[PDB]
Design an enzyme around this catalytic site. Structure first.
Site, PDB file in Angstrom:
ATOM      1  N   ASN A 194     -10.222   0.311   1.128  1.00 60.50           N
ATOM      2  CA  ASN A 194      -9.128   0.123   2.057  1.00 60.50           C
ATOM      3  C   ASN A 194      -9.666   0.325   3.472  1.00 60.50           C
ATOM      4  OD1 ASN A 194      -7.739   0.321  -0.463  1.00 60.50           O
ATOM      5  ND2 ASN A 194      -5.904   1.172   0.548  1.00 60.50           N
ATOM      6  N   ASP A 240       0.815  -1.209   0.000  1.00 57.91           N
ATOM      7  CA  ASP A 240       0.000   0.000   0.000  1.00 57.91           C
ATOM      8  C   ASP A 240       0.860   1.276   0.000  1.00 57.91           C
ATOM      9  OD1 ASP A 240      -2.513   1.408   0.240  1.00 57.91           O
ATOM     10  OD2 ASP A 240      -2.032   1.645   2.406  1.00 57.91           O
ATOM     11  N   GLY A 274     -10.222   4.942   2.359  1.00 55.76           N
ATOM     12  CA  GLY A 274     -10.885   5.553   3.475  1.00 55.76           C
ATOM     13  C   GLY A 274     -12.353   5.691   3.164  1.00 55.76           C
ATOM     14  N   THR A 326      -8.166   1.536   9.763  1.00 54.48           N
ATOM     15  CA  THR A 326      -8.087   1.800  11.202  1.00 54.48           C
ATOM     16  C   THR A 326      -8.923   0.778  11.965  1.00 54.48           C
ATOM     17  OG1 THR A 326      -7.692   4.121  10.918  1.00 54.48           O
ATOM     18  CG2 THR A 326      -8.749   3.487  12.990  1.00 54.48           C
ATOM     19  N   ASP A 366       1.969   5.708  -4.803  1.00 59.04           N
ATOM     20  CA  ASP A 366       1.189   6.873  -4.426  1.00 59.04           C
ATOM     21  C   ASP A 366       2.029   8.124  -4.679  1.00 59.04           C
ATOM     22  OD1 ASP A 366      -0.483   8.813  -3.606  1.00 59.04           O
ATOM     23  OD2 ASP A 366      -0.239   8.443  -1.439  1.00 59.04           O
TER      24      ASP A 366
HETATM   25 ZN   LIG Z   1      -4.120   7.319  -0.582  1.00 57.13          ZN
END
Ligand SMILES: [Zn+2]
Ligand SMILES: [Cl-]
Ligand SMILES: [Cl-]
Ligand SMILES: [Zn+2]
Ligand SMILES: [Zn+2]
Ligand SMILES: [Zn+2]
Ligand SMILES: [Zn+2]
Lengths: 264, 259, 262, 256
Positions: A214, A81, A193, A217, A103
């Protein structure tokens, strides 16, 4: 079995479900996620990233990720990731991650293209797919199209009203944005998120083209409830409960995203 | 580096120290132990056994154990503890454990010999050392039985029962040391006092199995971190395991012995 | 299965047989030797060394060696022959050789000891056995030498180095006798080609526990190559494998190691 | 390094070259082929198949194929040729072949589709490409076969087994199908006709027994020499023949 994220994100797109991406960085998190995906007969993504290297030796723990992915009776994608550099994602590949994310979304648009395309051009010859990211500022449909066409990336994390991580007020997904980005772009769409988003709104976003979500948390927080509950128990008992808590939360996310049953 | 327990237990016997055996069954326990052995420049034994299979998938976690053992700059022995069958220790060997315990100590003398010798006769042709146990850790070891037991089985090392339990009778260790020449192993040494450990080592204990104390050290960090983020709590568990392993390594005299 | 040369050379010593060491550097050689050991129910040593690195990529071929050794139903030792440096034998160890020879026999006695002991001190902590070699260190006059391993020098050498087995310079059965009596480790014979069958059998009865096969497999292979030179390559290479098996079986039977894996 | 045949066949298609597929079943054949691909800075396919499993233990030899593929500085594809069953190609995949052929071309059209699709449907979720074979190949059957199976490449019958090629078949199939075209049984086709075939869409050419023939010339030349020398000469003969095919096919320099 080690699975191809291109095939599975295609399947998710076409059948209107989403694949859960779980960040796993120790034994109980990994086992709990695999327990959930086996029980639900679901494809799943297990991911590591640079944020966990201070906790866990990736170069050693990766062997356990790969072993469990191989031996599972369901599709398991091993993913790196938020890849911050070519060396970092190359190191992920040499250690058996079969799906990578580069990213470069913190950079200007042209530099995001250049760095993303660099990763694609290195890894496509090796058969390895590359997820990229393009950033309330909503992702623009035409910019997203240009970005994907120019980089050759295999999937695109988009901003649709979702918060990448923490939120203040309840995120409001813009479903018109989802539809228009989906229509503009030839590859699967990803959310980094989804916290604070209602179940009904997650389900709507999935129905409109979000194919991978994704979880960043929620496993950690589910684990800590078991830690706190078992803080006066033997360590072996505490860790059995941590694994079960992780499994229960992973199962909740798999059923919410509609990927249960989709492996068979 | 993957290390030979026979070489290291011999070194320990001859230089009057003991090798620490640590039971590890998850990522933070393994990492904490390796952290300690690297810092202390010490040989170490990392161990899994049947008591952990309900917690962790050994067949998958074994790859991480072996990986860290191979890459460490200090001697790491990969050990299967309390093996109650040929099948379980054969499984251990095929997953990269390079030291095995065949524990047939629940059986009468003759059947303990036969089962132990079965393991020795299978594994010695493969270069794999076999620790055996005489006494149950309750039944204390008899010295004359020990002589005959080691001679007939051919076992590489002997776990003894001297009051140690998963009270402590140093006369027993003393007599066993004069009855056999193989390295002696102390199980259940969590909660024996520092002075008694030094005594046991001076009378010929060369390997000391620490189980519960790493679990205890972990749970101290848990109680101290129960309102913390999971990532932080797990860093503190690894650090707590490292500090407890370091303490045991220094107590046992194995610090520095890797050079 | 990957096997311990210490256990097997001790077995060979005590039961008065010898284990065959075959140098194998390609697929048909490796497969024929494994075929022979499986058929004969025999321990076997498969070896690579520096004399072959220009023919075959050791670092790649080693993977087939180790795989076949692991999957065999008989004991297979993976051995690095005539190791010329710590780097070379270290490279052999990291590629799955579980038995090493450090050959420092070309140097003076103390230097042989120093280089041999260096290998032993590095590899014993890792559980890896080290075969060493001690030739003739001549105390005799230069005139008499015109008109081979000394047993006392052999005992000092093994004691100071800690080596696990010793290659000795010997046909002269006195030397085998006297070195067997002087040292506590298994004895190894290099350069046995052309020793008569009867004399090999006598050398083994007197304490030789491992015998290195020189170019016998190579010559067996070339008889099949010659015989099949107008056949398709697949057929030729199958007959090479079979010829290597046959020659390997012959040595295993001569050495008495057939049946010894049970 | 272990390479994706889909990427490389696409590159060959677009740049009008073909990748050589070499069948290798022993140390000298593998090393000679890798030698040639490195020297020519070319992608290459190294292949095993059922025809060689009695000669050489595939499950053990596969480790040396994979090790050399990974360590090579050029793209190396590990391929299972003429896969005759799901079990056989599954075994290939578990021993590190990253590209498979399911050959159901013995069967009539519908059955070839069904068996080929079975392989595609199993292996695509694992990220593994499947080559199929149909066959002169009919362009409409080719389009339908590719569409219905989802296969990643197609071996075609163009007069290959004096062999006269029908180039119009290659053109019409290239135009009907969206995947790369493959030629088996190229022996005895002229250099000029190979070049023509590549120019019209052939992107992968299977070298049938030409490495075997080259090895046997070294054998006849070296019948009185020691085995170590003979084998050096076999490896060199393989290298030479493989280089000749790589250069003919135009894949030299395409790795960089
Ligand atoms: Zn991201
Ligand atoms: Cl561009
Ligand atoms: Cl007995
Ligand atoms: Zn115990
Ligand atoms: Zn020699
Ligand atoms: Zn020699
Ligand atoms: Zn064909």
């Amino acid at each position: 079995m080690l699975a191809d994220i291109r095939y599975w994100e295609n399947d998710a797109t076409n059948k209107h479900y989403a694949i859960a991406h779980f960040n796993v960085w120790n034994a109980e998190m990994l086992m709990g996620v695999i327990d959930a995906a086996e029980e639900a007969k679901s494809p799943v993504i297990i991911s590591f990233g640079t944020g966990f290297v201070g906790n866990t030796s990736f170069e050693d723990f990766s062997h356990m990720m790969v072993s469990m992915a191989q031996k599972a009776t369901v599709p398991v994608i091993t993913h790196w990731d938020h890849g911050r550099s070519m060396e970092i994602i190359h190191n992920a590949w040499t250690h058996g991650m079969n799906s990578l994310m580069r990213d470069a979304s913190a950079f200007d648009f042209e530099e995001n293209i250049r760095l993303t395309k660099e990763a694609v051009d290195f890894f496509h010859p090796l058969g390895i797919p590359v997820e990229a990211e393009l950033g309330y500022h909503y992702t623009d449909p035409d910019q997203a199209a240009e970005f994907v066409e120019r980089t050759g990336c295999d999937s695109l994390a988009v901003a649709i009203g979702n918060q990448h991580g923490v939120y203040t007020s309840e995120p409001q997904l813009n479903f018109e944005v989802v539809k228009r980005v989906r229509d503009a772009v030839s590859v699967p769409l990803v959310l980094h998120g989804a916290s604070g988003i209602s179940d009904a709104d997650i389900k709507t976003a999935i129905s409109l083209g979000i194919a991978k979500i994704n979880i960043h948390t929620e496993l950690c927080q589910a684990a800590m409830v078991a830690v706190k509950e078992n803080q006066d128990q033997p360590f072996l008992h505490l860790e059995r409960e941590v694994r079960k808590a992780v499994k229960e939360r992973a199962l909740e996310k798999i059923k919410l995203f509609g990927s249960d049953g989709k492996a068979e």
